[PDB]
Amino acid sequence: QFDFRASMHMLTSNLTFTVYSDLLAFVSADTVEPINAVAFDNMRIMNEL
Amino acid sequence: KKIQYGAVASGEKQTKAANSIANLALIKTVLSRISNKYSFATKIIRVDGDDNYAVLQFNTEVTKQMVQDVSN
Secondary structure, three states: OOOOOOOOOOOOOOOOOOOOOOOOOOOOOOOOOHHHOEOOOOOEOOOOO | OOOOOOOOOOOOOOHHHHHHHHHHHHHHHHOOOHHHOOOEEEEEEEEOOOOEEEEEEEOOOOOHHHHHHHHO
16 A cells, blocks of 8 residues: 655765866876886886997 | 979979978978967878878867968
């Protein structure tokens, strides 16, 4: 049997958020000039001549 | 008819290399104006007569709008 009052509920939610799918588009990235490019040892690579 | 034409064409020992020079200088001069609105690194320029192309690399990934605005 249908009880209108007992059937009533209040549903909560957040108000007005915005969902961003991609996550690296906001990142801009650049490389040092590869002549002065360095490895783990803090010592240049492609230096022998 | 004889018309005032104080400009360049073929039929000369000079036309080829000199046109390459002038087009190279022209693009080097223009390409330093997009820099007023974009950051890019000119990787390569080439000029051969009836065409010329320059490649350029950005700090980020390319979009449609940057292509449009760069062209305009």
